[PDB]
Curated annotation (Swiss-Prot), chain A:
Signal peptide (from-to): none
Source organism: Saccharomyces cerevisiae (strain ATCC 204508 / S288c)
Gene symbol of the encoding locus: RPC10
Protein family membership: Belongs to the archaeal Rpo12/eukaryotic RPC10 RNA polymerase subunit family.
Primary location recorded for the protein, binned into one broad class: nucleus
Keywords: DNA-directed RNA polymerase, Metal-binding, Nucleus, Peroxisome, Ribosome biogenesis, Transcription, Zinc, Zinc-finger
Official protein name in the record: DNA-directed RNA polymerases I, II, and III subunit RPABC4
One GO MF term: DNA-directed RNA polymerase activity
Entry binding sites for Zn(2+): C6, C9, C23, C26
UniProt subunit comment: Component of the RNA polymerase I (Pol I), RNA polymerase II (Pol II) and RNA polymerase III (Pol III) complexes. Component of the RNA polymerase I (Pol I) complex consisting of 14 subunits: RPA135, RPA190, RPC40, RPA14, RPB5, RPO26, RPA43, RPB8, RPA12, RPB10, RPC19, RPC10, RPA49 and RPA34. The complex is composed of a horseshoe-shaped core containing ten subunits (RPA135, RPA190, RPB5, RPO26, RPB8, RPB10, RPC10, RPA12, RPC19 and RPC40) where RPA135 and RPA190 form the DNA-binding cleft.
Further remarks about this protein from its record: Present with 907 molecules/cell in log phase SD medium.
Top-level taxonomic group: Eukaryota
Curated annotation (Swiss-Prot), chain B:
Keyword Amino-acid biosynthesis: no
GO BP term, example: transcription open complex formation at RNA polymerase II promoter
GO cellular component terms listed in the entry, alphabetical order: nucleus; transcription preinitiation complex
Sequence repeat copies, ranges: 66-142
Entire-sequence positions represented here: 177 to 342 of 345
Organism of this sequence: Saccharomyces cerevisiae (strain ATCC 204508 / S288c)
Further details from the record: Present with 6750 molecules/cell in log phase SD medium.
Keyword Amino-acid biosynthesis among UniProt keywords: no
Keywords: Metal-binding, Nucleus, Repeat, Transcription, Transcription regulation, Zinc, Zinc-finger
Summary of the function given for this chain in its UniProt record: General factor that plays a major role in the activation of eukaryotic genes transcribed by RNA polymerase II.
Principal place of residence: nucleus
GO molecular function terms listed in the Swiss-Prot or TrEMBL record: RNA polymerase II complex binding; RNA polymerase II complex recruiting activity; RNA polymerase II general transcription initiation factor activity; TBP-class protein binding; zinc ion binding
Protein name: Transcription initiation factor IIB
Localization of this protein: Nucleus
Domain of life, per lineage: Eukaryota
Swiss-Prot record, chain C:
GO biological process: regulation of DNA-templated transcription; RNA polymerase II preinitiation complex assembly; transcription elongation by RNA polymerase II; transcription initiation at RNA polymerase II promoter; transcriptional start site selection at RNA polymerase II promoter
Description of how the protein assembles with itself and partners: TFIIF is composed of three different subunits: TFG1/RAP74, TFG2/RAP30 and TAF14.
Keyword Nucleotide-binding carried by entry: yes
CC annotations in GO: nucleus; transcription factor TFIIF complex
Cited function: TFIIF is a general transcription initiation factor that binds to RNA polymerase II. Its functions include the recruitment of RNA polymerase II to the promoter bound DNA-TBP-TFIIB complex, decreasing the affinity of RNA polymerase II for non-specific DNA, allowing for the subsequent recruitment of TFIIE and TFIIH, and facilitating RNA polymerase II elongation.
Annotated family: Belongs to the TFIIF beta subunit family.
Protein name: Transcription initiation factor IIF subunit beta
A molecular-function term among this protein's GO annotations: RNA polymerase II complex binding
Keyword DNA-binding: yes
Residues represented out of the complete protein: 38 to 358 of 400
Modified residues (Phosphoserine): S19
Miscellaneous field: Present with 520 molecules/cell in log phase SD medium.
Protein backbone atom coordinates (compact mmCIF):
# COMPACT_ATOMS: atom_id res chain seq x y z
CA UNK A 1 0.00 0.00 0.00
CA UNK A 2 2.81 2.38 0.95
CA UNK A 3 6.12 2.65 -0.86
CA UNK A 4 9.48 1.62 0.62
CA UNK A 5 13.05 1.13 -0.61
CA UNK A 6 15.47 -1.41 0.84
CA UNK A 7 18.58 -0.09 2.58
CA UNK A 8 21.35 -1.57 0.43
CA UNK A 9 19.80 -3.42 -2.53
CA UNK A 10 17.58 -0.39 -3.37
CA UNK A 11 14.55 -2.53 -4.23
CA UNK A 12 11.10 -0.95 -4.29
CA UNK A 13 8.42 -2.58 -2.14
CA UNK A 14 4.76 -2.03 -1.26
CA UNK A 15 3.81 -2.63 2.37
CA UNK A 16 0.45 -2.96 4.09
CA UNK A 17 -0.16 -3.01 7.84
CA UNK A 18 -0.05 -6.80 8.28
CA UNK A 19 3.16 -7.18 6.25
CA UNK A 20 6.36 -7.80 8.19
CA UNK A 21 8.84 -4.97 7.70
CA UNK A 22 11.58 -6.84 5.82
CA UNK A 23 12.96 -6.85 2.29
CA UNK A 24 11.52 -9.54 0.03
CA UNK A 25 14.47 -9.66 -2.40
CA UNK A 26 17.58 -9.82 -0.18
CA UNK A 27 16.08 -10.33 3.29
CA UNK A 28 17.37 -7.09 4.80
CA UNK A 29 15.38 -5.61 7.68
CA UNK A 30 15.98 -1.89 7.03
CA UNK A 31 13.57 -0.07 4.71
CA UNK A 32 13.28 3.65 3.97
CA UNK A 33 9.90 5.26 3.31
CA UNK A 34 9.73 6.74 -0.18
CA UNK A 35 10.12 10.40 -1.10
CA UNK A 36 6.73 12.10 -1.30
CA UNK A 37 5.19 12.56 -4.73
CA UNK A 38 3.94 16.10 -4.09
CA UNK A 39 5.86 19.19 -5.17
CA UNK A 40 7.78 20.75 -2.29
CA UNK A 41 8.38 24.51 -2.21
CA UNK A 42 11.75 26.03 -1.30
CA UNK A 43 12.70 29.69 -1.22
CA UNK A 44 15.98 30.05 -3.09
CA UNK A 45 17.54 32.21 -0.36
CA UNK B 1 5.91 -22.26 24.15
CA UNK B 2 2.76 -20.12 24.56
CA UNK B 3 4.90 -16.99 24.73
CA UNK B 4 6.78 -17.92 21.55
CA UNK B 5 3.53 -18.66 19.71
CA UNK B 6 1.94 -15.42 20.94
CA UNK B 7 5.00 -13.39 19.92
CA UNK B 8 5.11 -15.26 16.54
CA UNK B 9 8.63 -16.35 17.54
CA UNK B 10 7.31 -19.90 17.77
CA UNK B 11 9.70 -22.72 18.65
CA UNK B 12 8.95 -26.44 18.65
CA UNK B 13 8.45 -29.04 21.37
CA UNK B 14 11.90 -30.42 20.55
CA UNK B 15 13.42 -26.98 21.22
CA UNK B 16 11.59 -26.52 24.52
CA UNK B 17 12.52 -30.10 25.50
CA UNK B 18 16.16 -29.39 24.65
CA UNK B 19 15.92 -26.50 27.10
CA UNK B 20 13.77 -28.10 29.83
CA UNK B 21 14.05 -31.79 30.71
CA UNK B 22 10.30 -32.44 30.55
CA UNK B 23 8.34 -35.56 29.65
CA UNK B 24 6.45 -35.16 26.37
CA UNK B 25 3.05 -36.49 27.51
CA UNK B 26 2.49 -34.23 30.50
CA UNK B 27 4.08 -31.33 28.60
CA UNK B 28 1.30 -31.72 26.04
CA UNK B 29 -1.28 -32.10 28.81
CA UNK B 30 -0.01 -28.93 30.52
CA UNK B 31 -0.05 -27.03 27.22
CA UNK B 32 -3.65 -28.07 26.55
CA UNK B 33 -4.73 -27.10 30.09
CA UNK B 34 -3.01 -23.70 29.89
CA UNK B 35 -4.50 -23.03 26.44
CA UNK B 36 -7.95 -23.76 27.89
CA UNK B 37 -7.24 -21.46 30.86
CA UNK B 38 -5.99 -18.69 28.56
CA UNK B 39 -9.07 -18.96 26.33
CA UNK B 40 -11.28 -18.81 29.43
CA UNK B 41 -9.43 -15.73 30.67
CA UNK B 42 -9.80 -14.11 27.24
CA UNK B 43 -13.54 -14.85 27.22
CA UNK B 44 -13.93 -13.47 30.76
CA UNK B 45 -11.88 -10.31 30.17
CA UNK B 46 -10.53 -8.70 27.02
CA UNK B 47 -11.14 -10.70 23.85
CA UNK B 48 -8.26 -11.41 21.47
CA UNK B 49 -8.39 -12.55 17.86
CA UNK B 50 -6.04 -15.50 17.32
CA UNK B 51 -5.34 -14.71 13.59
CA UNK B 52 -3.21 -17.89 13.40
CA UNK B 53 -0.91 -17.45 16.39
CA UNK B 54 -1.73 -20.52 18.54
CA UNK B 55 -1.83 -22.82 15.48
CA UNK B 56 -0.04 -26.11 16.02
CA UNK B 57 1.71 -26.30 12.66
CA UNK B 58 3.16 -22.79 12.04
CA UNK B 59 5.49 -24.31 9.44
CA UNK B 60 6.35 -20.98 7.80
CA UNK B 61 7.95 -19.72 11.03
CA UNK B 62 10.32 -22.71 11.28
CA UNK B 63 11.86 -22.31 7.81
CA UNK B 64 14.09 -19.22 8.44
CA UNK B 65 15.52 -20.58 11.70
CA UNK B 66 16.30 -23.98 10.19
CA UNK B 67 17.80 -22.33 7.11
CA UNK B 68 19.96 -20.19 9.41
CA UNK B 69 21.06 -23.34 11.25
CA UNK B 70 21.98 -24.94 7.91
CA UNK B 71 23.64 -21.75 6.63
CA UNK B 72 21.37 -21.40 3.59
CA UNK B 73 21.03 -18.25 1.46
CA UNK B 74 18.02 -15.96 1.62
CA UNK B 75 16.64 -16.98 -1.79
CA UNK B 76 16.83 -20.65 -0.75
CA UNK B 77 15.03 -19.73 2.48
CA UNK B 78 12.28 -17.90 0.56
CA UNK B 79 11.89 -20.79 -1.89
CA UNK B 80 11.64 -23.18 1.06
CA UNK B 81 8.93 -20.96 2.58
CA UNK B 82 7.04 -21.09 -0.72
CA UNK B 83 7.41 -24.89 -0.88
CA UNK B 84 6.22 -25.28 2.72
CA UNK B 85 3.23 -23.03 1.95
CA UNK B 86 2.37 -25.13 -1.11
CA UNK B 87 2.74 -28.41 0.81
CA UNK B 88 -0.50 -27.58 2.65
CA UNK B 89 -2.41 -28.06 -0.62
CA UNK B 90 -0.95 -31.57 -0.98
CA UNK B 91 -3.28 -33.93 0.88
CA UNK B 92 -0.84 -36.78 1.49
CA UNK B 93 1.87 -34.74 3.23
CA UNK B 94 -0.32 -32.19 5.06
CA UNK B 95 -0.84 -34.74 7.84
CA UNK B 96 2.88 -34.87 8.61
CA UNK B 97 4.49 -32.90 11.41
CA UNK B 98 5.36 -29.26 10.62
CA UNK B 99 9.03 -29.95 11.45
CA UNK B 100 9.08 -32.76 8.89
CA UNK B 101 7.28 -30.63 6.28
CA UNK B 102 9.72 -27.75 6.78
CA UNK B 103 12.75 -30.06 6.69
CA UNK B 104 11.72 -31.89 3.52
CA UNK B 105 10.89 -28.57 1.80
CA UNK B 106 14.29 -27.19 2.85
CA UNK B 107 16.07 -30.33 1.61
CA UNK B 108 14.17 -30.20 -1.69
CA UNK B 109 15.25 -26.60 -2.19
CA UNK B 110 18.82 -27.52 -1.19
CA UNK B 111 18.86 -30.15 -3.94
CA UNK B 112 17.29 -27.56 -6.26
CA UNK B 113 19.97 -24.92 -5.52
CA UNK B 114 22.87 -27.46 -5.49
CA UNK B 115 23.77 -26.56 -1.90
CA UNK B 116 26.44 -29.12 -0.91
CA UNK B 117 24.66 -30.32 2.25
CA UNK B 118 23.75 -33.98 2.51
CA UNK B 119 20.48 -35.36 3.87
CA UNK B 120 22.44 -36.92 6.73
CA UNK B 121 23.88 -33.50 7.59
CA UNK B 122 20.41 -31.91 7.44
CA UNK B 123 19.12 -34.65 9.72
CA UNK B 124 21.99 -34.25 12.18
CA UNK B 125 21.43 -30.48 12.28
CA UNK B 126 17.62 -30.53 12.57
CA UNK B 127 17.15 -33.81 14.54
CA UNK B 128 15.08 -35.52 11.83
CA UNK B 129 15.57 -39.11 10.67
CA UNK B 130 17.48 -39.31 7.39
CA UNK B 131 15.02 -41.97 6.21
CA UNK B 132 12.15 -39.60 7.01
CA UNK B 133 13.82 -36.80 5.00
CA UNK B 134 14.47 -39.16 2.08
CA UNK B 135 10.88 -40.45 2.13
CA UNK B 136 9.52 -36.90 2.21
CA UNK B 137 11.71 -35.92 -0.74
CA UNK B 138 10.74 -39.04 -2.71
CA UNK B 139 7.04 -38.33 -2.16
CA UNK B 140 7.36 -34.60 -2.96
CA UNK B 141 9.25 -35.53 -6.15
CA UNK B 142 5.88 -36.20 -7.83
CA UNK B 143 4.57 -32.66 -7.12
CA UNK B 144 7.65 -30.80 -8.41
CA UNK B 145 5.72 -28.36 -10.62
CA UNK B 146 3.44 -26.94 -7.92
CA UNK B 147 6.02 -26.73 -5.12
CA UNK B 148 8.89 -24.99 -6.93
CA UNK B 149 8.38 -21.23 -7.11
CA UNK B 150 7.52 -20.32 -10.75
CA UNK B 151 9.43 -17.07 -11.27
CA UNK B 152 12.59 -18.82 -10.05
CA UNK B 153 12.54 -21.07 -13.11
CA UNK B 154 11.28 -18.11 -15.17
CA UNK B 155 14.44 -16.19 -14.25
CA UNK B 156 16.49 -19.37 -14.64
CA UNK B 157 18.19 -19.36 -11.24
CA UNK B 158 17.03 -22.99 -10.79
CA UNK B 159 15.62 -25.72 -13.02
CA UNK B 160 13.43 -28.73 -12.27
CA UNK B 161 15.86 -31.11 -14.00
CA UNK B 162 18.36 -30.61 -11.15
CA UNK B 163 16.38 -32.63 -8.60
CA UNK B 164 17.57 -36.27 -8.52
CA UNK B 165 15.00 -38.90 -9.42
CA UNK B 166 13.50 -41.71 -7.39
CA UNK C 1 56.96 -43.21 54.95
CA UNK C 2 54.68 -42.41 57.89
CA UNK C 3 56.32 -42.78 61.31
CA UNK C 4 56.18 -41.35 64.83
CA UNK C 5 59.28 -40.12 66.64
CA UNK C 6 60.42 -39.77 70.27
CA UNK C 7 60.24 -43.56 70.56
CA UNK C 8 61.72 -44.68 73.87
CA UNK C 9 60.28 -48.15 73.18
CA UNK C 10 63.07 -48.75 70.59
CA UNK C 11 60.72 -49.97 67.86
CA UNK C 12 63.10 -48.74 65.13
CA UNK C 13 65.25 -51.84 65.70
CA UNK C 14 62.28 -53.96 64.61
CA UNK C 15 60.78 -51.66 61.95
CA UNK C 16 64.00 -50.56 60.21
CA UNK C 17 66.85 -52.91 59.36
CA UNK C 18 68.95 -50.02 58.03
CA UNK C 19 70.56 -47.72 60.58
CA UNK C 20 68.93 -44.30 60.88
CA UNK C 21 72.22 -42.49 61.55
CA UNK C 22 73.80 -40.16 59.00
CA UNK C 23 76.36 -41.90 56.79
CA UNK C 24 79.47 -39.73 56.76
CA UNK C 25 82.73 -41.28 55.46
CA UNK C 26 82.01 -40.08 51.90
CA UNK C 27 81.77 -36.47 53.15
CA UNK C 28 85.43 -35.87 52.23
CA UNK C 29 84.51 -36.32 48.55
CA UNK C 30 85.33 -33.20 46.51
CA UNK C 31 82.28 -31.82 44.68
CA UNK C 32 82.14 -28.89 42.25
CA UNK C 33 78.85 -26.95 42.30
CA UNK C 34 78.52 -26.13 38.59
CA UNK C 35 75.90 -23.83 37.05
CA UNK C 36 74.77 -24.36 33.44
CA UNK C 37 72.75 -22.57 30.75
CA UNK C 38 69.50 -24.24 29.73
CA UNK C 39 70.78 -26.22 26.73
CA UNK C 40 73.50 -27.97 28.74
CA UNK C 41 71.12 -28.25 31.70
CA UNK C 42 68.41 -29.89 29.58
CA UNK C 43 70.95 -32.24 28.00
CA UNK C 44 72.49 -33.11 31.38
CA UNK C 45 69.50 -33.26 33.76
CA UNK C 46 66.92 -35.32 31.84
CA UNK C 47 66.51 -38.86 33.16
CA UNK C 48 66.10 -40.41 29.70
CA UNK C 49 69.79 -39.55 29.21
CA UNK C 50 72.69 -40.21 31.62
CA UNK C 51 73.46 -43.92 31.21
CA UNK C 52 76.97 -43.52 32.62
CA UNK C 53 78.37 -42.39 29.27
CA UNK C 54 81.26 -39.96 28.96
CA UNK C 55 80.12 -36.37 28.41
CA UNK C 56 83.39 -34.45 28.21
CA UNK C 57 86.98 -33.97 29.31
CA UNK C 58 88.32 -31.50 31.88
CA UNK C 59 91.60 -29.66 31.31
CA UNK C 60 93.16 -27.70 34.19
CA UNK C 61 95.99 -25.30 33.31
CA UNK C 62 98.03 -24.44 36.41
CA UNK C 63 99.61 -21.29 34.95
CA UNK C 64 96.56 -19.23 35.90
CA UNK C 65 94.26 -21.93 37.34
CA UNK C 66 92.12 -22.04 34.20
CA UNK C 67 89.58 -24.85 33.80
CA UNK C 68 88.21 -25.81 30.38
CA UNK C 69 85.51 -28.37 29.58
CA UNK C 70 85.61 -30.13 26.19
CA UNK C 71 82.50 -32.13 25.32
CA UNK C 72 82.47 -35.10 22.97
CA UNK C 73 80.99 -34.95 19.47
CA UNK C 74 78.36 -37.63 20.15
CA UNK C 75 75.62 -35.40 21.58
CA UNK C 76 75.17 -32.47 19.17
CA UNK C 77 76.99 -30.27 16.67
CA UNK C 78 75.05 -27.03 17.27
CA UNK C 79 76.29 -26.66 20.86
CA UNK C 80 79.93 -25.71 21.54
CA UNK C 81 82.56 -28.30 22.41
CA UNK C 82 84.69 -25.94 24.53
CA UNK C 83 83.59 -24.03 27.63
CA UNK C 84 85.35 -22.07 30.37
CA UNK C 85 84.65 -22.91 34.02
CA UNK C 86 84.60 -19.59 35.88
CA UNK C 87 85.38 -20.08 39.57
CA UNK C 88 82.83 -17.78 41.22
CA UNK C 89 84.13 -18.84 44.66
CA UNK C 90 87.58 -20.43 44.83
CA UNK C 91 87.01 -21.32 48.50
CA UNK C 92 83.50 -22.52 49.37
CA UNK C 93 82.61 -23.06 53.02
CA UNK C 94 79.70 -24.71 54.86
CA UNK C 95 78.38 -26.30 51.65
CA UNK C 96 77.86 -30.06 51.44
CA UNK C 97 76.07 -32.58 49.23
CA UNK C 98 73.82 -35.22 50.80
CA UNK C 99 71.58 -37.95 49.40
CA UNK C 100 68.08 -38.88 50.54
CA UNK C 101 66.92 -42.50 50.37
CA UNK C 102 63.85 -44.43 51.48
CA UNK C 103 64.26 -46.88 54.36
CA UNK C 104 63.20 -50.52 54.75
CA UNK C 105 59.89 -50.52 56.62
CA UNK C 106 59.30 -54.22 55.93
CA UNK C 107 60.68 -56.55 58.65
CA UNK C 108 62.66 -27.32 80.63
CA UNK C 109 62.95 -31.06 81.30
CA UNK C 110 59.31 -31.70 80.35
CA UNK C 111 58.97 -33.84 77.23
CA UNK C 112 56.24 -35.48 75.16
CA UNK C 113 56.71 -38.97 73.60
CA UNK C 114 55.47 -37.80 70.19
CA UNK C 115 57.30 -35.62 67.66
CA UNK C 116 56.02 -36.85 64.24
CA UNK C 117 59.50 -37.59 62.95
CA UNK C 118 59.88 -38.95 59.42
CA UNK C 119 63.22 -40.82 59.31
CA UNK C 120 65.04 -41.28 56.01
CA UNK C 121 68.29 -42.93 54.95
CA UNK C 122 70.56 -39.90 54.57
CA UNK C 123 74.24 -39.77 53.66
CA UNK C 124 76.62 -36.83 53.27
CA UNK C 125 78.25 -37.80 49.97
CA UNK C 126 80.33 -34.72 49.22
CA UNK C 127 81.76 -31.35 50.17
CA UNK C 128 81.36 -28.41 47.80
CA UNK C 129 84.81 -26.86 47.37
CA UNK C 130 84.46 -24.94 44.08
CA UNK C 131 81.43 -22.95 42.94
CA UNK C 132 81.70 -22.80 39.16
CA UNK C 133 79.72 -21.33 36.29
CA UNK C 134 79.89 -22.52 32.68
CA UNK C 135 80.56 -19.93 29.97
CA UNK C 136 80.72 -20.70 26.24
CA UNK C 137 84.13 -19.78 24.86
CA UNK C 138 84.32 -16.66 22.71
CA UNK C 139 86.49 -18.25 20.00
CA UNK C 140 84.35 -21.36 19.46
CA UNK C 141 82.55 -21.72 16.09
CA UNK C 142 79.26 -22.32 17.97
CA UNK C 143 79.28 -19.28 20.28
CA UNK C 144 77.36 -17.37 17.60
CA UNK C 145 74.87 -20.26 17.58
CA UNK C 146 74.48 -19.82 21.34
CA UNK C 147 73.98 -16.06 20.90
CA UNK C 148 71.34 -16.80 18.24
CA UNK C 149 69.60 -19.28 20.56
CA UNK C 150 69.59 -16.82 23.47
CA UNK C 151 68.19 -14.16 21.13
CA UNK C 152 65.51 -16.61 19.99
CA UNK C 153 64.55 -17.10 23.65
CA UNK C 154 63.37 -13.48 23.83
CA UNK C 155 62.31 -13.45 20.16
CA UNK C 156 59.79 -16.31 20.03
CA UNK C 157 56.32 -16.13 21.58
CA UNK C 158 54.95 -19.14 23.47
CA UNK C 159 51.30 -18.07 23.10
CA UNK C 160 49.16 -18.34 19.97
CA UNK C 161 46.37 -15.98 18.97
CA UNK C 162 42.67 -16.68 19.41
CA UNK C 163 41.07 -18.79 16.69
CA UNK C 164 38.42 -16.91 14.71
CA UNK C 165 35.56 -19.04 13.41
CA UNK C 166 35.29 -18.43 9.66
CA UNK C 167 32.17 -20.61 9.32
CA UNK C 168 28.74 -19.02 8.85
CA UNK C 169 27.44 -17.55 12.11
CA UNK C 170 24.13 -19.40 11.80
CA UNK C 171 25.98 -22.71 11.52
CA UNK C 172 28.02 -21.66 14.56
CA UNK C 173 24.90 -20.74 16.57
CA UNK C 174 22.90 -23.83 15.54
CA UNK C 175 24.22 -25.58 18.69
CA UNK C 176 23.04 -22.84 21.04
CA UNK C 177 20.04 -22.74 23.37
CA UNK C 178 17.02 -23.42 21.22
CA UNK C 179 18.29 -26.37 19.21
CA UNK C 180 16.82 -29.46 17.60
CA UNK C 181 19.63 -31.75 18.76
CA UNK C 182 19.13 -33.56 22.05
CA UNK C 183 22.11 -33.87 24.39
CA UNK C 184 23.73 -37.24 23.70
CA UNK C 185 26.31 -36.80 26.47
CA UNK C 186 25.92 -38.99 29.56
CA UNK C 187 27.66 -36.60 31.98
CA UNK C 188 25.81 -36.45 35.33
CA UNK C 189 22.79 -38.53 34.36
CA UNK C 190 21.93 -39.01 38.02
CA UNK C 191 18.20 -38.91 37.29
CA UNK C 192 18.67 -41.47 34.51
CA UNK C 193 20.60 -43.84 36.77
CA UNK C 194 18.18 -43.31 39.69
CA UNK C 195 14.79 -43.58 37.94
CA UNK C 196 15.65 -46.93 36.32
CA UNK C 197 15.59 -48.67 39.73
CA UNK C 198 12.00 -49.58 40.64
CA UNK C 199 11.20 -51.65 43.74
CA UNK C 200 7.96 -53.59 43.22
CA UNK C 201 6.77 -55.77 46.09
CA UNK C 202 4.07 -58.40 46.51
CA UNK C 203 1.86 -58.87 49.59
CA UNK C 204 3.19 -61.96 51.33
CA UNK C 205 0.85 -63.48 53.96
CA UNK C 206 0.75 -62.08 57.47
CA UNK C 207 2.16 -65.19 59.16
CA UNK C 208 5.13 -65.19 56.75
CA UNK C 209 5.89 -61.48 57.14
CA UNK C 210 5.62 -61.65 60.95
CA UNK C 211 7.91 -64.71 60.99
CA UNK C 212 10.44 -62.85 58.84
CA UNK C 213 10.23 -59.74 61.04
CA UNK C 214 10.71 -61.83 64.19
CA UNK C 215 13.76 -63.51 62.64
CA UNK C 216 15.25 -60.14 61.67
CA UNK C 217 14.59 -58.67 65.13
CA UNK C 218 16.36 -61.73 66.56
CA UNK C 219 19.23 -60.93 64.18
CA UNK C 220 19.49 -57.30 65.29
CA UNK C 221 17.25 -55.43 67.71
CA UNK C 222 16.93 -51.88 66.32
CA UNK C 223 15.82 -51.20 62.75
CA UNK C 224 15.21 -48.25 60.45
CA UNK C 225 12.45 -48.20 57.85
CA UNK C 226 14.70 -47.99 54.78
CA UNK C 227 17.06 -50.75 55.92
CA UNK C 228 14.28 -53.09 56.98
CA UNK C 229 12.42 -52.30 53.74
CA UNK C 230 15.42 -53.22 51.60
CA UNK C 231 15.72 -56.35 53.75
CA UNK C 232 12.05 -57.38 53.43
CA UNK C 233 10.74 -56.02 50.05
CA UNK C 234 7.30 -55.01 51.36
CA UNK C 235 4.97 -52.01 50.93
CA UNK C 236 5.18 -49.22 53.49
CA UNK C 237 1.50 -49.51 54.45
CA UNK C 238 1.53 -53.24 55.25
CA UNK C 239 5.01 -52.96 56.76
CA UNK C 240 3.77 -50.31 59.20
CA UNK C 241 0.58 -52.35 59.76
CA UNK C 242 2.75 -55.17 61.13
CA UNK C 243 5.40 -52.95 62.74
CA UNK C 244 2.96 -51.07 64.97
CA UNK C 245 1.52 -54.39 66.13
CA UNK C 246 4.78 -56.11 67.04
CA UNK C 247 7.20 -53.19 67.41
CA UNK C 248 7.51 -49.57 68.48
CA UNK C 249 9.49 -46.55 67.30
CA UNK C 250 12.01 -44.83 69.56
CA UNK C 251 11.33 -41.11 69.95
CA UNK C 252 13.67 -39.79 72.66
CA UNK C 253 16.58 -42.22 73.07
CA UNK C 254 19.94 -42.17 71.31
CA UNK C 255 18.50 -44.72 68.83
CA UNK C 256 15.48 -42.55 68.01
CA UNK C 257 13.54 -42.68 64.71
CA UNK C 258 14.12 -46.45 64.65
CA UNK C 259 11.69 -49.35 64.98
CA UNK C 260 12.65 -51.82 67.71
CA UNK C 261 10.96 -54.94 69.05
CA UNK C 262 8.45 -54.63 71.86
CA UNK C 263 9.73 -55.25 75.42
CA UNK C 264 7.35 -58.22 75.73
CA UNK C 265 9.01 -59.99 72.78
CA UNK C 266 12.47 -58.67 73.76
CA UNK C 267 12.91 -61.38 76.40
CA UNK C 268 11.85 -64.02 73.85
ZN1 LIG D 1 16.83 -5.64 0.01
Amino acid sequence: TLKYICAECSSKLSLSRTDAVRCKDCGHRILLKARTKRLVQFEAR
Amino acid sequence: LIGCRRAEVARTFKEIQSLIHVKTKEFGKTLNIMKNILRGKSEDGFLKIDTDNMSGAQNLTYIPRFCSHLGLPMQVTTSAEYTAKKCKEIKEIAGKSPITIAVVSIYLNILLFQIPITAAKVGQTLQVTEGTIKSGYKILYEHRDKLVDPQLIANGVVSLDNLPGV
Amino acid sequence: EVFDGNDIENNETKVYEESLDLDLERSNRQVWLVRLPMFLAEKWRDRNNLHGQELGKIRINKDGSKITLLLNENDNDSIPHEYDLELTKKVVENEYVFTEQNLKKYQRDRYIPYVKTIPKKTAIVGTVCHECQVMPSMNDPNYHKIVEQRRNIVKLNNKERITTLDETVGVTMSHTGMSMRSDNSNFLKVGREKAKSNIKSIRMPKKEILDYLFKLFDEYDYWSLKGLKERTRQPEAHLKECLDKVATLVKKGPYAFKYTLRPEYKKL
